[PDB]
């Protein structure tokens, strides 16, 4: 008669077990972004100008003091690094990383995107079906700025490169039942992004990995979704009356 149940699952955390790790956790990439680049509000109109856009961006590279120090830091840490050749490598990484999501291959995506970027592009589309393609690139990519941070705890240096890319993409997200959800397939919408890359310099391997994606505050709103949503009203307990803010 004396038989009872087992296996009740709960997640409990304390400070003591976390401080008793014999081998400290090793992080391949930093968590946050050191400095967020602030593009001027006129980039939506400068992008239609060829000479003005290229010349202005080139000056910003050669005039920043902190950026030039970071560029020299990468050169000293690792030779054979060229700023001119970087955007073509960054452009190919961007295309390859998204094509991995189309094929839902996670093994390749781990090498392309970083640890802080992987959950954002996988979590939501885990059970969905997306179809992403590249058609054109109206403006060649430009390097915006380069930053570095020296963590004296272990001597690790991370080199973040911010790249502004004007891309023409065709995005269509399908529901798990096979019905269309977000966008069409044959519309080449023009999109602009400020992709931030990251590379570990102390690591002898040190692959170039995409770190984050920065959207300008004044960016146009994204295309509306097909599904209709309803924002629920405030749940009211019986002894509380509704108040209308104005």
Partner 1 sequence: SQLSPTELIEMQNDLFNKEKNRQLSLTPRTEKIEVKHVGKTDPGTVFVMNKNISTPYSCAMHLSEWYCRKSILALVDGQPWDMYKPLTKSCEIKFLTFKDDDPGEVNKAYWRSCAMMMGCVIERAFKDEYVVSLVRAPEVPVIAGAFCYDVVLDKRLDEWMPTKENLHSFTKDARALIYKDLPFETLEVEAKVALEIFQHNKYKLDFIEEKASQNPERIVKLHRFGDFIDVSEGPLIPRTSICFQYEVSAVHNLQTQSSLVRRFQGLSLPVHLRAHFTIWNKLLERSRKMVTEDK
Partner 2 sequence: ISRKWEKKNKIVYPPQLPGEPRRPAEIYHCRRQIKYSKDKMWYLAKLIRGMSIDQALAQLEFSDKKGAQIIKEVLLEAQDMAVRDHNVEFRSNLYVAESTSGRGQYLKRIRYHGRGRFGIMEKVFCHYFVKLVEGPPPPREAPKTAVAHAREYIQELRNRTITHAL
Partner 3 sequence: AAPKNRRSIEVNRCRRRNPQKLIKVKNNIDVCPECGHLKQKHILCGYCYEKVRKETAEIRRQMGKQEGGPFRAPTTETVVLYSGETPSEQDQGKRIIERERKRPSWFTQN
CA 195 – CA 217 distance, rounded (Å): 15
- Range list of H helices, 78-203: 86-103, 106-112
CA 35 – CA 67 distance, rounded (Å): 11
Per CB under 8 A, 243 contacts partner 3: no
Binding mask 221-240 for partner 3 (x = CB under 8 A): -----------------xx-
Distance of closest approach, residue 231 Cβ to partner 3, in angstroms: 17
Give the number of residues in contact with partner 1, rule: CB under 8 A: 11
Q: Which stretch binds partner 1 (CB under 8 A): 32-40, 64-72, 115-123, 225-233?
A: 225-233
Query: 111 to each of 37, 49, 106, 230, how far by Cα in Å?
Result: 25, 36, 9, 40
Give the one residue of 78, 115, 139, 175 binding partner 2; rule: CB under 8 A: 175
Give the one residue of 45, 72, 176, 222 binding partner 2; rule: CB under 8 A: 176
Sequence-distant (6+) residues with CB within 8 A of 126 are none
The values of phi and psi at residue 49, to 5°, are: -110, 130
- Residue found by looking up tokens 């039942």 in the block: 177
Name the binder of 239 from partner 3, partner 1, partner 2, none, CB < 5-8 A by kind: partner 3
In the complex with partner 2, which residue's Cβ is closer, 1 or 50?
1
Sequence-distant (6+) residues with CB within 8 A of 2 are none
Per CB under 8 A, 226 contacts partner 1: yes
Q: Which of helix, strand or coil describes residue 76?
A: helix
Task: Report the interface residues with partner 1, using CB under 8 A.
Answer: 224, 226, 228-234, 242, 244
Binding site for partner 3 (CB under 8 A): 238-239, 241
Give the interface with partner 2 as residue ranges (CB under 8 A).
1, 3-5, 127-129, 131, 174-179, 181, 227-230
């Amino acid at each position: 008669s004396e038989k009872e149940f087992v296996e009740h699952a709960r997640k409990a955390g304390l400070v003591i077990p976390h401080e008793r790790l014999e081998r400290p956790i090793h992080l391949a990439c930093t968590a946050g972004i050191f400095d967020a680049y602030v593009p001027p509000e006129g980039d939506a109109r400068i992008s239609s100008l060829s000479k003005e856009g290229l010349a202005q961006r080139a000056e910003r590279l050669k005039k920043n003091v902190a950026s030039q120090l970071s560029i020299r830091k990468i050169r000293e840490s690792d030779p054979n690094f060229k700023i001119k050749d970087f955007p073509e490598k960054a452009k190919d990484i961007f295309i390859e990383a998204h094509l991995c999501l189309n094929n839902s291959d996670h093994d390749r995506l781990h090498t392309l995107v970083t640890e802080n970027c992987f959950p954002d592009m996988v979590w939501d589309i885990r059970y969905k079906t997306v179809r992403w393609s590249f058609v054109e690139s109206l403006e060649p990519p430009q390097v915006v700025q380069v930053r570095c941070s020296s963590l004296m705890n272990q001597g690790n240096i991370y080199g973040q490169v911010t790249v502004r890319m004007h891309t023409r993409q065709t995005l269509a997200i399908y529901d798990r039942f096979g019905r269309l959800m977000y966008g069409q397939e044959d519309v080449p919408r023009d999109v602009l992004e400020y992709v931030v890359f990251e590379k570990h310099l102390v690591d002898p391997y040190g692959s170039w990995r995409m770190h984050g994606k920065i959207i300008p505050p004044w960016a146009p709103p994204k295309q509306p979704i097909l599904k209709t949503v309803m924002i629920p009203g405030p749940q009211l307990k019986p002894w509380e009356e509704f108040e209308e803010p104005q």
